[PDB]
Each structure stands twice: as structure tokens, then as C-alpha cells.
Design a protein around this nucleic acid. Structure first.
Lengths: 80, 126, 98, 203, 154, 96
RNA sequence: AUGCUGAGAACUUUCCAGAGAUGGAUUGGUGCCUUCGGGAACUCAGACACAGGUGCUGCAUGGCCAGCUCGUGUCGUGAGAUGUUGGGUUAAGUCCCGUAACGAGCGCAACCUCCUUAGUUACCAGCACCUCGGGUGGGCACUCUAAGGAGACUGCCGGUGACAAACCGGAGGAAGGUGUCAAGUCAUCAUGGCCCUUACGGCCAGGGCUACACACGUGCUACAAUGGUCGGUACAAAGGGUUGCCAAGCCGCGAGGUGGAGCUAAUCCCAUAAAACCGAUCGUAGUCCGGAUCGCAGUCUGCAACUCGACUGCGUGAAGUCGGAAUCGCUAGUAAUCGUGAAUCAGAAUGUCACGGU
């Protein structure tokens, strides 16, 4: 599975400091309180940090991303 | 008349012989023996009682018996040759002990045992 | 433990707390009759409307003991009951045969 | 492996004979728990051997096979509604309560096992009394009683399977019946479970 | 120590009319199908003589001449060197090594016709110049140093 | 008539009160149509230590019976619906 | 889990600082028994006390091949021994006869083909008919899977042996002799010496458990030749089935989401299938069995698939060559290669798989 049976992503409560923050300039990182929470495919180039409990990682996002989770910026098991 | 009821059984069957006298004609499961079967040797294993009771000229045999596998109730044609004929007469009574093809073998797949692999096929130990 | 056996047991009246919006929003999604403008209207459904409306975090246990393993569909009880129920006679029809 | 799960049929009877449908099989299995937990800690007086729980026409059926009516029954139903209310409010269905007569009650095993936990906590002797539990209940009727005592018996490191046996009790066959009364309680130190294997006559 | 088993040979072949050959479907049955086995139980015996000039029961019977041994290879203790046991034995021993090892050289030929790569060795015993005949003459002259050990230290 | 009953011993004693008490009233009711043992094997664990070599066998039976009344007027099916149970028999009825 | 006191009983608390709970605007309600006194449940709440042991600890706190012990009696100064040795036999402390021994409990041994009445709705042994798939009466006899049942022998003759346990042989008849090993849990019911005692009574938790650098408990699968790639055969097919199982699919090379024959299943959804004929071109290969990071990307749970998932379409990127040093281990139904359908009512529970037809 995980095909494009779900085409778009219209999620209302994961949104109200994201879609409104287009007119506002990009000076602060958008902090996230999940390992799941995603955002639009038309906003491409924001910053989301991997949320688990101790420290944050470098997150670099370019224009060409379509596929899957945020689990690559910090790893699943990051080789302690 | 000669309108009787015999029964061969392999793998929990209930057979139907529509038996009558005749001249050695064989048939099985609404088919002939040259009609459902072929590409086996199990057809004329039943020949071994058949030619020794010398009934190859006297009877018409149609033992419908269904179920089992490919050559499983090829083991039922073994049984039902003389059941519906010794309910007629007593000529071949003591002359069939040499073959011995009536006992429904209870050494088939009985109850399922846990811990083992199969009925009494034992697993790997040390 | 005391603050565990009475905080996830209350999911009987909180997961189906709404129970009428939860069926009026989850059948016509399986129908392709929604229009191309109407991908969004059926997605104001159940999450920020406080998110005890899905059921991915409930588990089946025993009643008097509370063991999740050994639980079957034919009981509300578990594996440490069957040896000690039908001999005192707590289960009907459980009879040894072959 | 259990012996007491075999005789569900041609010798004794089920105590839960009730039916709902194949998907409905566990609706009245919710009410089959809380009744036995009220007779263990509270109604130790007039102790209980076997409880029949059935679903007859339109309510329920629970029969409490005690020994002493004079402590329960008083002045034409003063506690009959007190068992009818305190039980059936957590039970899903209400119960009309009948009381039967088990005159000469010394031949149930639970009517002996639930009388020794009242005797072992207050320093009454652990060796003379388990003898006399079956010295005076063996005049008329039963032919033999075994009591396997593997337990505490004063000393904390004891696995001595004691030999308080009196008579002939085979406990492997089905026509010679097996009784099994494993009550457990808390004495002043050491966990002691009272086990009773009274053998009545066969057939 | 008592022998409790009862020897029950069952020999009745449906078409072939043999004497000792009938029930042999045991290593022709490779834990598989009987309908695969139909050109190789008797259909391979209908494939031996197709280049030859006889009946296939002629050549089969005479395997009890030169691929059947004379002495036996079982090991025995006295107080020293482990002595094997040479003796004239009844046919159930020596002819047991005249039928099952004759077919056991079937993989180092690996030719066309699965039916032929089982029974393409049986006709070589007319003079007895095949594969199982080499080891039978090895037995007799690896029994010179043993043949006096039958009563004395045996 | 179709029921929903337990086993061998509570339908073979529940159909004895049906057919004779329906033949008394001048009607014709057919005889009992059999049903064999409901074969289903049950496997659980019994060992105090976790053990894969220890399973066992159990079963719950489910036996019902086919009957039918030729001239449907019987009070044996409605008035003797409350009689044909003892402790937990649930007698379904059919007007056949 | 708490005793005393509360506005408003409880609800609604959907919506907003939540990118992430709620306190609250809480969008409305006064409820509830009537000596018209009184009373009580709760979203949260300010005092006192605690509940939590989620480190330690199986050491004063686990109970569910066959032989071992008691009681009585003896001999022995006693510990202890006889019973239980022996002789003939036994799967056997199974016995027969001897024998200062005699009776016991335990393990062992045993316990878990014959049938009245039968088939409302399968279908063709009675038969008309049939699309010869049986629409259907009739299938109770030439039956459709039985609830429960005389059930299998020391039964018998004869040669051995003390005639005796047994052991050898024959019946009939297409069936005849079977109480043990100072070790995993003060933790699924239990229970200690110290502890957290503005606390593991606070929880929306600001992520840091696989550098390949090995031996291996190794234990399906082949030895390239029966030769290298499919949509086909006489062909599986019912139950749980009132918040379920999810047609012929229109979709298909192979996806049977809208469809829905079956909605309480002698019905059916995975419903399709069995290693057979002579299967093709060519007739015996570490390779035209070979794809491990570069499937990108395709209207199905549905508010939660922004550099990772079934869908195997085979353009590619290999290590499978008689198992030898030595050892898993096979004396009879056995060494042995056709699959699981169903929840507290939402369907990827793999070495011990409902039937391995050999």
C-alpha cells in the first residue's frame, strides 16, 4: 500500500501556524510535537525538527521531495 | 432378486453397488474402469481375486465409491469385489484368506498430537 | 498499580463518546460520489474535535485478572480461567470428546 | 491434567447451563463472576459448597447450597431481599433465591475446607486437629478420606507431603468420584491453603 | 532379545507377470507422484528390451550371479582387533546387495529420458559387465585375511 | 421446527416432550432428523512455565434438529415452549 | 483510593492562545425525593493524610528408564537389615513356585463391526423430468458426514517348563492373540531489612539503544540438464457470520475500492485450483534458475504516507559441483515436498498448518 489513494493533504489543526505563515517572513523554526506531523506539498523549503525528547538535528529541505516520512533528517536508530 | 447392497470404504465412504450377474463387466463411479482411470497400474490389482474366484464370466460389477485422493480409493477397489457376492452364496468363503483385502486399515492419519510434528512422526531432539 | 487500571478502561464511553458523528463521517468516504471540490468538507471530522475519536489504542484483556494474552472471542475471560471454570462449572458446553 | 473436567455429562451436572447465540455467547458470562466473590470474604458463616447459575424464563437463577439456615433465615424473609439487592445490582439480571435442605452436611468437601481456616489462625494445634477433622465425620456413610498435606505445618522450609490418610480413596478413576476443595487463607505467618479430598461412595 | 516382526511380502503385479519384482515401488517413488511413476515402474521395463531381443524378466532374474556377494561385512569384538564375519549366508542377505545397489548408480549417467536413466543399467548383466559387478569381486579378495575367523575368535 | 440447543443430552430429552404431546391432539408431526457431532478442536496452554510443547484438547458441541408440522395449528409449539426448557435451553420454534 | 466544605447536579466543554491537553466565552437547561424542612451524584477545586515500590531480594514466604516407602513381626548390642533375596518369567516391584516373613499404599497395569427412527430447503440407488447443473413431488429400502451403543479374547485344544507364570503355534474367516539435580519471580494470588517521602501524587516528555571487526544450536530448499519463461486438465469450496464475511467484477497481463447472487447460510466472499497425457525451438551450463543501495510512482483505512512497502512486468549487479575432518540420527504405517476459514463484532499472527492420497 501507501499509494496515492490519498491525493491531497487537507489537515486543519496541523495547519494554523503554517498556511497563515506564508505572508510572514521565515525567521523562526516551526517546532513540531510529533514524529508523524507533515505539511503541504506547495510550501516546499520549511524546517521541521525530529521530535523525541533531548536535542535537535540539522534539517535541510530542497525542492524535490514527494515520498515518505520525516525519518531521514534524524534517523530511526541514529547509531549511538 | 440380485438387487443388493454392498459397500467399499476408504476415507469414510458409503458405497453403492448396483450388482447383477453377467459376464465380467467392470465399472466404477458412474464411469467405466477404462473411462475414469487409466495412466495407472491400480486398475488390475483387483484382477488378483477376480481371476482366482473364476467370476470373470459370471457377474457385472459397478462399485461407486467416492472421496479420498488420486490413488487412495484405488485402495477401495481392493475391498469391494466379494462383499456383495458372499451375501449370495458360500462357494468362495474360505478360498479368500490368501488375499486378505477387507480390513479397513486404522493405521491411517488418526488424532492430531501436539508437541510432535504429525501423528507419531517425531521432531528434532538432542 | 492503581492509576493504570482505571484510565484506559474508561474508553468504553470516550472512544464512542460522540457515536453519531462517527458514523455520519465514515461511510461516504468509501463512496466515490464526492465531487472534485468536495475533497475537504468530509475532512473536518474527528481530530481537533478532541482526538479520542479513533480506536488504535485499545486492547482486550480479562475481567477479574486483567491478562491480555490468552483472550479469545468466545469469552470475556482468559487462559488462566478455562482450567478453573468449567470444573466448578462456569462455562456451558465445554465437554471433552474426540 | 484435570480429572474434574471429564465428568461433565453422564455422572454429575454442569452448574452453568444457559445459552445465548454464537455471537451472543458472552453476554451472560459477564454476570458469572461477582457472585462467588461475595461468599468467600463475607458469608463464611453457613459456608457454600456448589452454586448453580442458570438462565430460566426472563430473569436468572442462583441457588446457594449452604448448611445453616438459622443464621441466614430469620423471621420470614428479612435477609432474603438483602441477598436479592446486594448481589443483583452489579449482576446484569435479578435472581429469585430458593433455599434447600442439606441435612447431615458433613459429606461435602467445601463444608469442611471452609471450616479449618477459622481454626488455624488462632494457634490451635496443626497436628491433632487434622486427624480429628476426619475422626468424627466418619461414623456413618463414607468409607475413606485422604488429605494430602504438602505445605507449611509450623516450619517455613517444609516440602513434607504429609500422610493424613484414613481408608481407601482412589483419585484417578471417574466412577470413584474425586472431590477438590482448595480453600486458601492467611494464617499469622505462612500461606496455608486448606485442601480437602472427602471420598463418598461410588454410584 | 526376540525377533517380533513377521515377514510379509506382498507380490501381485497387474500386467507384468513377475515373481519377485512387483512391490518394488519404493525408491522409484521419490516421495512424489504415481502418475509420474508410470513410465518408469513398468514403462522402463518396456524400455529396457526395446533395443534388445528378449523378455525383460530374463535379464532381471540373473542379477543373483555376480553382483551378489559371498561373505558379510559386520564387525565383531573379541578382546582385540575388530573382526568381520565371513560365512556362507542364506539368499536374503547376499541378494539384498544384488538389487538395490544395481539401481543406485543412476546419477552419474544423467542422460535423456528419466525413464531410461533408472533402467539403463539392468541389461548390462548378461555377461555382468556393469557398475555393481566391480565391487562384488572386491569382496572375495578382501576376505582372504578373515576367512579363518568363523569359530576361533568370532 | 428448528431449535438452538446445547448438545446430545438436552435436545434428545427436549424433543421427547414435543412430538408425542403434539400427536396426542389429533395432528401429524414427523420424526427426528439427525445431526452429528460438531467437530471443532480447541488448543490452549496449561503449564505454569511458558512452554510450547504443552497443548491439549477441548470442544463445545452444538446440536440442532429439523422438524416440521404438517397441519399448522398446534398449541404444542406455543404453550409448550415454556415447558421444553429446564435450566438454560432456549427453544426457538419454526412453523413448518 | 480518600474524610470535611462549593457556585453550578451531571451534559455541552465542538470552537480560540493548542504548530500540543484544557482552565474557560462555556453558544441552551434546573434539575430531584415534596412532614414543602431536608437530601444527594459531578468539569475543576483550597487543607490534613496518603495511595505509587516502575531498583534490591527464590536462601527464615511457590502449592496442583523404572523404582521408592509405611505398618506389623522377627533376627541384630545397635545403626541397620528381612520383606524387595533366590529359581523359573515379565513393557514392568509383571508374576508362578520356593522363602521369617505377612498384609499394604504409591509408579507400572486399567481409568479419559450391532440400531429402531432417521433427511422441511442437498439431489436421482425408486424414477418421470432436467440445461442428464437435477426446477421438484419421491429419495425412510438398491441411503446423505451418526447421539448413543453387544466392542476385540489368557478365549480355547496341543508340544516345553515344577505344569506355571508366561513363552512358542491353530481358530473362525476376503478381522485375531496384547521418589529424584544449595541455580529462572520478595513481580500476574502472594510477601521482607532500606528507600521516592514539593515524590516514579506533574506530565503536553527539549532523543543520543544495529561502526561488520567473528565463531556460530549447525536443523526446507541443489548438485544446471528432464533441459531454461505460462493465462490451460475428470478438480478445492463450508461455517462464526443483527458495529460482520467483503460476488461473475464493469477494473484485468495480475489490481475483483462504487458493485454486490449469500444479510442469520444441506447456500456462499479468499470460489480459482489437484505433482498425468507426447508438452513446444534446441536434446547433458557456476551460466538465457541469478536482479541485495539507483519502483520511481498508480480515483482503496480516511482530517495523520513532504529524499523508505504489498501490487514480483523480469531491461539486471555473482559466490547452489557427491557433504571428506566426523557426527543431528531410521527395525512399520514408518525415513516422506498439495493450504488454515472466522475479533472486545475493521480480514499482511511462517521451522511443530484443519487432508501431505506415497
Amino acid at each position: 500500500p501507501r499509494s496515492l489513494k490519498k491525493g491531497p493533504f487537507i489537515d486543519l489543526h496541523l495547519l494554523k501556524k503554517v498556511e497563515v505563515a506564508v505572508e510572514k517572513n521565515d525567521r523562526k523554526p516551526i517546532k513540531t510535537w510529533s514524529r508523524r506531523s507533515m505539511i503541504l506539498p506547495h510550501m516546499v523549503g520549511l524546517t521541521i525538527a525530529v521530535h523525541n525528547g533531548r536535542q535537535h538535528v540539522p534539517v535541510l529541505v530542497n525542492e524535490d521531495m514527494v515520498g515518505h516520512k520525516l525519518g531521514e533528517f534524524a534517523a530511526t536508530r541514529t547509531y549511538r | 432378486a440380485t438387487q443388493n447392497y454392498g459397500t467399499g470404504r476408504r476415507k469414510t465412504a458409503t458405497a453403492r453397488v448396483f450388482l447383477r450377474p453377467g459376464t465380467g463387466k467392470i465399472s466404477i463411479n458412474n464411469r467405466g474402469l477404462d473411462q475414469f482411470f487409466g495412466r495407472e497400474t491400480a486398475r488390475m490389482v483387483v484382477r488378483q481375486p477376480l481371476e482366482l474366484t473364476e467370476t470373470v464370466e459370471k457377474f457385472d460389477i459397478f462399485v461407486t465409491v467416492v472421496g479420498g485422493g488420486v490413488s487412495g480409493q484405488a485402495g477401495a477397489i481392493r475391498h469391494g469385489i466379494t462383499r456383495a457376492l458372499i451375501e449370495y452364496d458360500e462357494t468362495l468363503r474360505s478360498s479368500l484368506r490368501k488375499a486378505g483385502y477387507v480390513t479397513r486399515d486404522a493405521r491411517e492419519v488418526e488424532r492430531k498430537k501436539v508437541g510432535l510434528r504429525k501423528a507419531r512422526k517425531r521432531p528434532q531432539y538432542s | 498499580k492503581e492509576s493504570m487500571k482505571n484510565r484506559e478502561l474508561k474508553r468504553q464511553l470516550t472512544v464512542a463518546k460522540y457515536a453519531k458523528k462517527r458514523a455520519e463521517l465514515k461511510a461516504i468516504i468509501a463512496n466515490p460520489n464526492s465531487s472534485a471540490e468536495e475533497r475537504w468538507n468530509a475532512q473536518v471530522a474527528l481530530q481537533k474535535q478532541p482526538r479520542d475519536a479513533s480506536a488504535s489504542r485499545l486492547r482486550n484483556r480479562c475481567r477479574l485478572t486483567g491478562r491480555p494474552h490468552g483472550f479469545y472471542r468466545k469469552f470475556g475471560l482468559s487462559r488462566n480461567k478455562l482450567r478453573e471454570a468449567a470444573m466448578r462449572g462456569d462455562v456451558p458446553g465445554l465437554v471433552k470428546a474426540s | 491434567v484435570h480429572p474434574n473436567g471429564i465428568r461433565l455429562g453422564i455422572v454429575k451436572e454442569h452448574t452453568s447451563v444457559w445459552y445465548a447465540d454464537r455471537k451472543n455467547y458472552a453476554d451472560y458470562l459477564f454476570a458469572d463472576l461477582k457472585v462467588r466473590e461475595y461468599l468467600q470474604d463475607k458469608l463464611k458463616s453457613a459456608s457454600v459448597s456448589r452454586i448453580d447459575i442458570h438462565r430460566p424464563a426472563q430473569t436468572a437463577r442462583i441457588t446457594i447450597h449452604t448448611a445453616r439456615p438459622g443464621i441466614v433465615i430469620g423471621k420470614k424473609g428479612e435477609d432474603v431481599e438483602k441477598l436479592r439487592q446486594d448481589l443483583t445490582k452489579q449482576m446484569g439480571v435479578p435472581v429469585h433465591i430458593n433455599i434447600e435442605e442439606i441435612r447431615k452436611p458433613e459429606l461435602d468437601a467445601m463444608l469442611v475446607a471452609q471450616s479449618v481456616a477459622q481454626q488455624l489462625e488462632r494457634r490451635v494445634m496443626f497436628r491433632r486437629a487434622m486427624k480429628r477433622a476426619v475422626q468424627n465425620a466418619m461414623r456413618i456413610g463414607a468409607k475413606g478420606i485422604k488429605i494430602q498435606v504438602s505445605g507449611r505445618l509450623g516450619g517455613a522450609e517444609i516440602a513434607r507431603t504429609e500422610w493424613y490418610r484414613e481408608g481407601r480413596v482412589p483419585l484417578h478413576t471417574l466412577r470413584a468420584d474425586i472431590d477438590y476443595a482448595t480453600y486458601e487463607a492467611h494464617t499469622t505467618y505462612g500461606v496455608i491453603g486448606v485442601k480437602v479430598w472427602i471420598f463418598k461412595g461410588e454410584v | 532379545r526376540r525377533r517380533v516382526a513377521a515377514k510379509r511380502e506382498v507380490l501381485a503385479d497387474p500386467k507384468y507377470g513377475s515373481q519377485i519384482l512387483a512391490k518394488f515401488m519404493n525408491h522409484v517413488m521419490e516421495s512424489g507422484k504415481k502418475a509420474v511413476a508410470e513410465r518408469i515402474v513398468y514403462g522402463a521395463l518396456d524400455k529396457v528390451k526395446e533395443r534388445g531381443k528378449a523378455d525383460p524378466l530374463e535379464t532381471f532374474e540373473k542379477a543373483l550371479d555376480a553382483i551378489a556377494p559371498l561373505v558379510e561385512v559386520k564387525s565383531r569384538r573379541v578382546g582385540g582387533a575388530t573382526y568381520q564375519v565371513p560365512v556362507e549366508v542364506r539368499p536374503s542377505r547376499r541378494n539384498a546387495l544384488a538389487m538395490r545397489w544395481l539401481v543406485d548408480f543412476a546419477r552419474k549417467r544423467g542422460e535423456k529420458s528419466m525413464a531410461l536413466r533408472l533402467a539403463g543399467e539392468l541389461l548390462d548383466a548378461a555377461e555382468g559387465k556393469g557398475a555393481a559387478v566391480k565391487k562384488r569381486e572386491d569382496v572375495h579378495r578382501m576376505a582372504e585375511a578373515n576367512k579363518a575367523f568363523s569359530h576361533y575368535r568370532f | 421446527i428448528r431449535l438452538k440447543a446445547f448438545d446430545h443430552r438436552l435436545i434428545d430429552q427436549s424433543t421427547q416432550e414435543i412430538v408425542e404431546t403434539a400427536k396426542r391432539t389429533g395432528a401429524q408431526v414427523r420424526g427426528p432428523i439427525p445431526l452429528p457431532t460438531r467437530k471443532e478442536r480447541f488448543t490452549v496452554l496449561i503449564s505454569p512455565h511458558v512452554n510450547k510443547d504443552a497443548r491439549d484438547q477441548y470442544e463445545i458441541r452444538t446440536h440442532k434438529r429439523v422438524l416440521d408440522i404438517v397441519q399448522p395449528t398446534d398449541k404444542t409449539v406455543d404453550a409448550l415452549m415454556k415447558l421444553d426448557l429446564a435450566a438454560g435451553v432456549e427453544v426457538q420454534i419454526s412453523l413448518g
